[PDB]
Amino acid sequence: MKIVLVLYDAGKHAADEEKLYGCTENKLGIANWLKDQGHELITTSDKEGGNSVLDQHIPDADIIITTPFHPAYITKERIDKAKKLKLVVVAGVGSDHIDLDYINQTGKKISVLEVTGSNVVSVAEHVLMTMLVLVRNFVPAHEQIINHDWEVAAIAKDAYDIEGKTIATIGAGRIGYRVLERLVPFNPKELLYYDYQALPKDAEEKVGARRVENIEELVAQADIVTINAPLHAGTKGLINKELLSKFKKGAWLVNTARGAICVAEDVAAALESGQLRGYGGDVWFPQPAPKDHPWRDMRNKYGAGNAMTPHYSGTTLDAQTRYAEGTKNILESFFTGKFDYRPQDIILLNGEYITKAYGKH
Amino acid sequence: MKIVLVLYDAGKHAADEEKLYGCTENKLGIANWLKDQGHELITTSDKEGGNSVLDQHIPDADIIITTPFHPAYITKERIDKAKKLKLVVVAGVGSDHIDLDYINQTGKKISVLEVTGSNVVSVAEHVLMTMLVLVRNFVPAHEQIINHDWEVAAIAKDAYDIEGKTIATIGAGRIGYRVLERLVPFNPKELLYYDYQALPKDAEEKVGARRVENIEELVAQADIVTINAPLHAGTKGLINKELLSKFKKGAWLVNTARGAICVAEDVAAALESGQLRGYGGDVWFPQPAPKDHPWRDMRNKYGAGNAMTPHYSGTTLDAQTRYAEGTKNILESFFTGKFDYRPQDIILLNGEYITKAYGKH
Ligand SMILES: NC(=O)c1ccc[n+]([C@@H]2O[C@H](COP(=O)([O-])OP(=O)(O)OC[C@H]3O[C@@H](n4cnc5c(N)ncnc54)[C@H](O)[C@@H]3O)[C@@H](O)[C@H]2O)c1
Ligand SMILES: NC(=O)c1ccc[n+]([C@@H]2O[C@H](COP(=O)([O-])OP(=O)(O)OC[C@H]3O[C@@H](n4cnc5c(N)ncnc54)[C@H](O)[C@@H]3O)[C@@H](O)[C@H]2O)c1
Ligand SMILES: [Cl-]
Ligand SMILES: [Cl-]
């Protein structure tokens, strides 16, 4: 089989860390196995433009392996040219960079598999971190120190404790639930969630969560909102000017899910006007984020409220080994002709939606 | 009575936030309350040098109110000049900026009271935040974004999850225990503590903590160490070159307790050499931290591993109202002649140690 593997380039950083499996230099650490199995592997980070290495190889690729941190956008146009394509794998979690609805509506026999659970703890940690960084006003505090300044009041004037705050998650799946679990000992006033899938009652009770039926009612009462749903037609552009106007004034918003769940300029405008006190997370649309993407320079009225990073929360060194192994397992399920995929890894099975988390079908 | 109140100045920032009680502008909300009682209140941030406003008023001050974030250093030289001094109050927690041992050993009839518990949650949050920021490599990640860069591998090469790490606290009192409680749902490998005061077995079991009785044994097995003990003779310079040599190579160290528990240059050398991967916290010696203090510019080999802030974790807006009210209550106990202090607030009562947490007596 011919396999095209699209990952980020480590460049000079490859020499610093041998455990960096998720880059083009290291090929998920599965290149020996793919070679021994008799497959042809094309590895590249060159994923944009008409004569990109990706596009050169799409027409006879049997399998494309992608990673959300440097996502090959497998568009309708690319799918139409991909005459041998049978499987797209996501080394990570989240398959929205592939035009899933096009595959499904046309009934094309392409499976889409991701390594469910592989980095959900990593991201839940990152959400907790980002909440704390925003609420406690850490970014300008650290900036003060490295700029050789000292003025406690400049930081304290917009620093709070997370204790006693009302916190809402949009999506209460693997990541959203783990976020709620980690918040319990911080003594929030209340933990809320919105999801068309109810939590099991035992799970709900374990974290003291209350389900809110509609998203406007959810955000209106939350001091902190975190987004933990996949990107699909039902969540694309969900966080826009109108919905932001229904947030509690001065709320903090965390989004480690997908950038395009928000309308980028609407979030920036809300931060600058004070409707949000802070926004942070690691995900952007598109990726790599352009130099003029509004989320880079946006700030609140105090020059703070921005805890943006590149997309890396799900590609910590601990997460990388897990999604690398999961990727190998999915590939083996395909190669053996067993197709004995873990049920939870299956987004599309030969064009059919198996997941329930990407909207109702 | 004459009361000297030493707080940080908020300046123009006071105009931004009404709840900023902890600054010289707002005087803990007690200025009119004191005036109505016929007391004279001198308020200043000028606390260094022989003709500082502090030193001008020391000779006839009945009461000095301090705050750790901008600490009046009540040295033995100042105590010897403070002929009317009867009470020192700490608007906050931690009384080490006062020469407690000099007061005690030379029979000075001065009580020292602090607002115990007022900001212990705030600091425990800050510890969790700092642990996450260091372990997950957040600072350089955010720096990349605002420098208009994008390179996932530059961050991922030194980013880990807190899951599966062994975490040790030095001091397991109000803050240290609250840190362990907040760590439970993060699925650490193990939680450890070192303290001459044992946790009750039930409190140990609640967080799955194991006591380690030797400090070298403790740090030798820890991926993350956090300092949560007061500054006293037993902890001053506790974290020195020799102990750092016994830390696990590449450990992360967090200190929100007091700067002087660490030997400053020893920590910086350990970071630059890689014995530590990261150091962070909000506390320094002395405070305000000099522009050339080595903890400002220190970095690990990748230009990261620094999560320093000014001293503000215990002065979030949520904390300030609590220690402001507690300061009023302590003053009332003094003024009425009842001296009905909360027992947990008493560091020294007329020179005698009441606290057990500042070493054995
Ligand atoms: N930043 C990263 O590195 C990173 C890593 C992993 C995953 N993610 C993203 O997080 C998303 C969630 O991951 P997960 O493991 O929790 O997935 P999951 O499938 O376990 O949970 C997703 C939840 O979202 C719910 N949902 C779907 N549409 C919703 C809507 N309109 N409103 C509210 N809830 C809705 C689903 O019912 C489900 O319960 C992924 O799809 C991915 O886009 C990001
Ligand atoms: N960064 C901030 O804003 C901030 C805010 C509050 C307190 N603090 C500092 O944190 C310290 C702890 O606060 P707390 O509320 O937890 O106090 P606490 O009195 O409840 O607990 C202190 C613990 O440290 C233990 N201890 C003393 N010496 C020790 C030693 N050599 N080794 C190990 N343990 C030792 C004590 O036995 C006690 O259990 C304060 O004294 C203060 O210096 C900082
Ligand atoms: Cl939906
Ligand atoms: Cl001691």
Protein architecture, described:
- The structure is a homodimer of 361-residue chains.
- In chain A, helix 13 links the parallel strand 11 and strand 12.
- Chain A has 14 helices and 14 strands.
- The first copy, chain A, is globular.
- With 361 residues, chain A is an alpha/beta fold.
- The first copy, chain A, starts with a strand and ends in an 8-residue tail after the last strand.
- Helices cover 32% and strands 16% of the residues of chain A.
- The first copy, chain A, has 2 domains: 1-118 and 316-361, NAD(P)-binding Rossmann-like Domain (Rossmann fold, 3-Layer(aba) Sandwich), CATH 3.40.50.720; 119-315, NAD(P)-binding Rossmann-like Domain (Rossmann fold, 3-Layer(aba) Sandwich), CATH 3.40.50.
- A 7-stranded mixed β-sheet of chain A has the order 2-1-3-4-5-13-14, sandwiched between helices.
- The first copy, chain A, has helices at residues 31-36, 53-57, 76-81, 100-106, 120-135, 138-146, 152-156, 174-183, 201-207, 215-220, 241-244, 264-273, 294-297, 317-335; strands at 2-6, 40-44, 63-66, 87-90, 111-114, 166-170, 190-194, 209-211, 224-227, 251-255, 276-281, 306-308, 346-349, 352-353.
- The interface between A and B is large, with 73 and 73 residues.
- Bound molecules: nicotinamide-adenine-dinucleotide (2 copies) and chloride ion (CL) (2 copies).
- One chloride ion binds at residues 234, 359 of chain A.
- Residues 93-94, 119-120, 123, 170-176, 194-197, 228-231, 234-235, 256-258, 282-283, 313-314, 357 of chain B line the site of one nicotinamide-adenine-dinucleotide.
